[PDB]
């Protein structure tokens, strides 16, 4: 997260880290045994880390649980990043508490101009690299479809939206992929891609979760 702030320990209790020997993506706990992340974050053998603040110190809020299933949307296309969503089933249910809690799925898609909370352990610089120890947060609004399409000609599908600031300075960034965009108390987005980070006229692009509520419920039910 570039231009963000320290969230505060366990203030984003649905934020998870996906670990493949190191932190590589975020995700969002949506019930005690399922996480939503980005399809491009797929790896076999993922360990999900819940309750994290300082991603490099064992502090005592943590639960580490292996994925038992990591399910990329079948229509994910790595060439276009369309349908950039994955469901991870935890091998055993997380114990839910004030520090480890699920986030609700949307009941409707978000509107342009709604403020959202974006979070992660990614890079905090737009030039060069600096990775934070603690979880970072960013308040950022949903941008109009037309401004998103104008910024990324020919690349924005109906399954994507932009959020952030056209003036630049505030964005998600490398290491944030898969993590949450929460608006109106609901999981509306998944950190996916962008041109650089925090550049002018290049806002972050996010998977549009509201298009997948039925898919999510059906995939959970059958797995």
């Amino acid at each position: 997260i570039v231009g963000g702030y320290t969230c505060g320990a366990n203030t984003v209790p649905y934020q998870v880290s996906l670990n493949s020997g190191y932190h590589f993506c975020g995700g969002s706990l949506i019930n005690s045994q399922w996480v939503v992340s980005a399809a491009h974050c797929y790896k076999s053998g993922i360990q999900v880390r819940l309750g994290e603040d300082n991603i490099n110190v064992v502090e005592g809020n943590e639960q580490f649980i292996s994925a038992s299933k990591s399910i990329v949307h079948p229509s994910y296309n790595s060439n276009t990043l369309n349908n950039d969503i994955m469901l991870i089933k935890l091998k055993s249910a997380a114990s839910l508490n004030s520090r480890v809690a699920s986030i609700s799925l949307p009941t409707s898609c978000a509107s342009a101009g709604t403020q959202c909370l974006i979070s992660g352990w990614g890079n905090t610089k737009s030039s060069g690299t600096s990775y934070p120890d603690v979880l970072k947060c960013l308040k950022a609004p949903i941008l109009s479809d037309s401004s998103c399409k104008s910024a990324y000609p020919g690349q924005i599908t109906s399954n994507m939206f932009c959020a952030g600031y056209l003036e630049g300075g505030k964005d998600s960034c490398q290491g944030d992929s898969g993590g949450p965009v929460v608006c109106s108390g609901k999981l509306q987005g998944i950190v996916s891609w962008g041109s650089g980070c925090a550049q002018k006229n290049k806002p972050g692009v996010y998977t549009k979760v509201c298009n997948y509520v039925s898919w999510i419920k059906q995939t959970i039910a059958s797995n």
């Binding site: 020997g21 190191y22 932190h23 590589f24 993506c25 980005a38 491009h40 974050c41 790595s78 060439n79 990043l81 352990w121 990614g122 990775y131 990324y152 000609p153 020919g154 690349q155 998600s172 960034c173 490398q174 290491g175 944030d176 992929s177 898969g178 950190v191 996916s192 891609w193 962008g194 041109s195 650089g196 980070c197 290049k202 972050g204 692009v205």
Partner: protein
């Protein structure tokens, strides 16, 4: 243009695509530590 439209590259472990604007766009994952 920093790239020719339609090209691809990696930056570290992230995949990138060159848009029709001649600008790279990349995914936002973390990557293995360097040697």
């Amino acid at each position: 243009q920093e790239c020719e439209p339609g090209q691809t590259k990696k930056q570290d472990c992230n995949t990138c695509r060159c848009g029709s604007d001649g600008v790279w766009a990349c995914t936002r994952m973390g990557c293995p530590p360097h040697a």
